[PDB]
């Protein structure tokens, strides 16, 4: 039974490793999501996961896939440590307050509490990362930043510290949607599998249900995710509000534009969760018995 320090460090390392491994998927998702917002005179058009990744690699370099990676890693540290700490102090509290089972509702409550605090803590990282991922020299929009820390310094000096928390409420709404949809869909699909006994309750049912629940969460949070990416990436004054950005997306690009980057998003989610789970378990066991 690992100590708190082992949990914190293993969560940080596993989350950071999954982040560096699956970061090109996130960059592809951001590129697909900001595509269509502004017309481009270049022939470069992003379509698909491999298509977007290869287009970015061949027109901007391999290093452009990891644009904003230090921001992503800082978030991962904050989110992983905060997840462990608040998981303890909130879920133990929920189970011990009335002495009941770890229901679904308690999992929603703890997940939203932890995710809200994590979103607020890591919003500046996420703003910097989205802006660095979205910026390009090919589509007529001048890049604002040279790198992560340049982006921090410029945004803080020319937009205020509040400017580092732009898009906090879309991020929060998306985190709520992902958490609730994953939990509900996973439980429903598993107990649908079992209420029939369609598949064996070993790992494969869990894998299938987590796959389906992750896709369902990605699809449910995709409109919020596209609007969040476009709003956060936007310079001050372009969008009066977040619903203003959503309404412009709807009127000028329609409903399918709310699902841009859906395949990269789902692949990013699934692969990141798998990598972090395996790495986190291995690190916990190793530091528990090194």
């Amino acid at each position, epitope marked *: 039974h690992p100590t708190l320090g082992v949990q914190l460090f293993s969560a940080g390392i596993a989350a950071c490793l999954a982040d560096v491994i699956t970061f090109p998927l996130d960059t592809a998702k951001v590129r697909l999501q900001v595509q269509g917002e*502004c*017309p481009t005179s270049s022939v470069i058009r992003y379509k698909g996961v491999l298509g977007t990744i290869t287009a970015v690699v061949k027109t901007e370099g391999r290093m452009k896939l990891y644009s904003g990676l230090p921001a992503g890693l800082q978030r991962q540290i904050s989110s992983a440590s905060l997840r462990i700490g608040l998981y303890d102090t909130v879920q133990e509290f929920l189970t011990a307050g009335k002495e009941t089972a770890p229901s679904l509702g308690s999992k929603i409550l703890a997940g939203l509490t932890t995710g809200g605090v994590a979103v607020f803590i890591g919003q500046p990282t996420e703003v910097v990362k989205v802006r660095l991922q979205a910026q390009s020299h090919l589509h007529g929009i001048k890049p604002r930043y040279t790198g992560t820390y340049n982006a921090y310094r410029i945004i803080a000096t020319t937009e205020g510290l509040t400017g580092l928390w732009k898009g906090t409420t879309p991020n929060l709404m998306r985190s709520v949607i992902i958490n609730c949809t994953e939990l509900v869909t996973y439980d429903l699909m598993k107990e649908a599998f079992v209420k029939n006994n369609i598949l064996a309750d070993d790992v494969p049912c869990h894998l299938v249900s987590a796959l389906i629940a992750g896709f369902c969460a990605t699809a449910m949070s995709s409109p919020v995710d596209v609007v969040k990416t476009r709003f956060i990436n936007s310079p001050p004054g372009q969008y009066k509000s977040v619903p203003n950005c959503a*309404m412009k997306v709807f009127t*000028n690009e*329609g409903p399918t534009a709310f699902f841009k980057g859906l395949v990269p998003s789902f692949l990013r989610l699934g692969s990141w969760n798998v990598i972090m789970f395996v790495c986190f378990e291995q690190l916990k066991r190793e530091l528990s018995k090194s």
Partner: nanobody, 121 residues
Framework: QVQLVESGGGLVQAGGSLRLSCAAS????????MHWYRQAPGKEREWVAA????????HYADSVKGRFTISRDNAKNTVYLQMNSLKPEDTAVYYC??????????????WGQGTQVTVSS
């Protein structure tokens, strides 16, 4: 009931200037990108310019860039095409355009009646 009304076209010498207006009515212009097209007889309708919902970006056809500018006043529901150094090749009917995408498979095009611009030589 979308209505786009173009005005400001006329007959001008080559190298002259002309400011076209599009009065837009029956929709919330603040959410819609606006476009200027042109069609001359014996040619297809050519996209000229596009402006963002609030004027954040503006893009042009290569044949009109630097000569034509596109502008908005969402308060007056008006879109403007300033046309400078006009050449006889710019003689066409100029059309204001709104692509309403909304709850559709592809965008629906709304057009004005067009204003004729003739450049003399």
């Amino acid at each position: 009931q979308v209505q786009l009304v173009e005005s400001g076209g006329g007959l001008v010498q080559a190298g002259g200037s002309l400011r076209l207006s599009c009065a837009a009515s029956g929709f919330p212009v603040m959410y819609y990108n606006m476009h200027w097209y042109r069609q001359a007889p014996g040619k297809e309708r050519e996209w000229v310019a596009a402006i963002e919902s609030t004027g954040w970006w503006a893009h042009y056809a290569d044949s009109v860039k630097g000569r034509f500018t596109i502008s908005r006043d969402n308060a007056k529901n008006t879109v403007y095409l300033q046309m400078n150094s006009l050449k006889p090749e710019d003689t066409a009917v100029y059309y204001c355009n709104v692509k309403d995408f909304g709850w559709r498979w592809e965008a629906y095009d709304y057009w004005g009646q067009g204003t004729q611009v003739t450049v003399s030589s």
